Write a protein that binds this ligand. Structure first.
Ligand code: HCY
Lengths: 12, 252
């Protein structure tokens, strides 16, 4: 959960 | 095309460059030391895939819980398939090109259990050169693999999803036509390539229960990185009850 969800949901 | 976009071009340039395994071969090779290194490599590739996924035109528009359900179901499919492509384009042997700083040769191939598993992998690389699958065809297929497996009761954004999937199916069709143009066997090939895709479910099934075995079996020396460990610990449940829908191009 935690780790994966963070990674995508962002916006480089 | 240029005017607006091809998805296969917009893909070929989001396509991750190889990562270096960071392997030290100044020391003898061993079953454990390799698998563990690959897992470590795998963790980094998957992070290099999480980006790719969001940078896939259409992907970032699904339900959050969907976009990660997809990556969680198909990370193995992505890794295994891209494995073939590297082996294919880089080398030619019944070897495997995990990284430029790590290639399983017929020497490493002959390690304890190294080949038991390197088997199913080698396969995917066979087809890609057999069907002379092209970078343009491969890139569309790889996207379709990301969109190949969904929750047993469909995603939350099923509609939008089904719409995206079909787009890349047509893009795959475009690739087949845009190769040479000898239409004669184009539909033939489309049948084949989507047959390949359907069979990736098999190779994943096998690669995954060995991933799960090495992850549960604490006698072996194999270690996993944090990233992979979380994904795996989450998947062992689902895969141990039945919540999974594997999409097929041919229900033959
Ligand atoms: C993603 C990965 C590493 C990086 C890569 O280019 C391709 C793959 C696909 C197959 C994966 C592999 C590693 O993680 C180690 C795995 C899981 C292997 C399948 C079985 C495996 O050898 C093990 O089960 C090790 O315990």
């Amino acid at each position: 959960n935690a780790l994966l969800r963070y990674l995508l949901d962002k916006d480089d | 095309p240029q005017l607006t976009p091809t998805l296969v071009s917009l893909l070929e340039v989001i396509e991750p460059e190889v990562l270096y395994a960071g392997y030290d071969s100044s020391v003898p090779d061993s079953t454990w030391r390799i698998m563990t290194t690959l897992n470590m490599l795998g963790g980094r590739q998957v992070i290099a895939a999480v980006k790719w996924a969001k940078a896939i035109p259409g992907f970032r528009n699904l339900h959050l819980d969907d976009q990660m359900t997809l990556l969680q179901y198909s990370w193995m499919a992505l890794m295994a398939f891209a494995l073939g492509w590297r082996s294919y384009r880089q080398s030619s042997a019944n070897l495997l090109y995990f990284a430029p700083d790590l290639i399983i040769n017929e020497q490493r191939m002959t390690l304890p259990c190294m080949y038991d598993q390197c088997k199913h992998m080698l396969y995917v690389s066979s087809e890609l050169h057999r069907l002379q699958v092209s970078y343009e065809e491969y890139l569309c297929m790889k996207v379709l693999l990301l969109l190949s497996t969904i929750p047993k009761d469909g995603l939350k954004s099923q509609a939008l999803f089904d719409a995206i999937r079909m787009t890349y199916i047509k893009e795959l069709g475009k690739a087949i036509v845009k190769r040479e143009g000898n239409s004669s066997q184009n539909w033939q090939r489309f049948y084949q390539l989507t047959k390949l895709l359907d069979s990736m479910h098999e190779v994943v099934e096998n690669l995954l229960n060995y991933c799960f075995q090495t992850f549960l079996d604490k006698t072996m020396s194999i270690e996993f990185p944090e990233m992979l460990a979380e994904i795996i610990t989450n998947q062992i449940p689902k895969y141990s009850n039945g919540n999974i829908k594997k999409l097929l191009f041919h229900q033959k």
